[PDB]
């Protein structure tokens with residue numbers, strides 16, 4: 001099979017072939033690989049880099065795909081667009097996300113990778129480099145806790161999809177997914193389809209900054225009780241994965257993980 005990202009030092013221009021509106025500000029962007037028989041070449045859990053020249057600046061941003069090496073001919077990204085003239089303190093908006101939003105079908109952008117400190121090697125085995133300098137440390141776990149906000153769902157879905165497609169993978173994933181309003185719950189159909197098909201290995205819970213009137217899940221920021229009730233208990237010695245805005249990690253996740261009893265050595269932030 002042909003690998004797209006043959007070298008991590010080479011930038012590969014890929015063409016946009018599809019673009020799906022997921023919410024008011026978030027899209028799934030599908031790019032064609034060099035041939036329909038190509039695969040991306042992305043170990044489970046890692047990310048890529050997009051680069052482009054935008055107004056005299058060389059903009060480089062990382063993005064974690066939701067597709068896998070099982071997907072021939074394409075790669076899927078899920079990107080939130082930081083629109084201009086929308087936020088008072090940031091009137092110019094975000095550079096890369098608005099550039100992607102303006103891309104027409106067929107337009108190209110340079111991909112590079114893979115990159116990242118975590119790789120899922122299957123059957124509960126996670127290879128995590130303690131820092132950018134060291135070799136990966138292997139620890140096998142029976143369950144994984146997952147806290148995501150917004151597009152932080154993308155690395156989690158990469159791991160969830162890899163586990164569920166293997167019938168001999170008995171790892172159990174518990175996902176706590178936090179967003180602002182109900183319309184901001186990205187990839188809800190895909191998540192609930194996986195939960196309804198693999199309910200013994202996949203537990204799923206939402207919280208919202210502002211919930212609707214009829215709401216069966218959580219309301220408010222991630223807190224101590226949500227982690228206690230919807231992540232695996234610390235006695236199982238699970239791995240706890242996190243992806244979201246740095247302030248949500250700093251204020252909502254890390255202190256409340258300490259409160260429940262999940263040690264820092266068993267936690268990882270994408």
Ligand SMILES: Cc1cc2nc3c(=O)[nH]c(=O)nc-3n(C[C@H](O)[C@H](O)[C@H](O)COP(=O)(O)OP(=O)(O)OC[C@H]3O[C@@H](n4cnc5c(N)ncnc54)[C@H](O)[C@@H]3O)c2cc1C
Nearest residue numbers: 061062063064079080082087090093094095096097151154
């Ligand atoms: C490892 C990793 C993985 C990532 N994976 C993903 C992914 O899968 N999907 C994804 O969408 N992003 C992902 N990101 C985030 C991504 O790399 C960028 O930070 C994001 O796309 C913003 O880049 P930008 O150039 O569009 O905005 P920038 O030009 O970098 O904007 C600067 C900052 O200003 C703020 N800002 C600007 N305009 C607004 C606005 N209108 N409202 C609110 N705040 C605003 C934001 O905080 C923004 O980051 C990932 C980041 C990392 C480090």
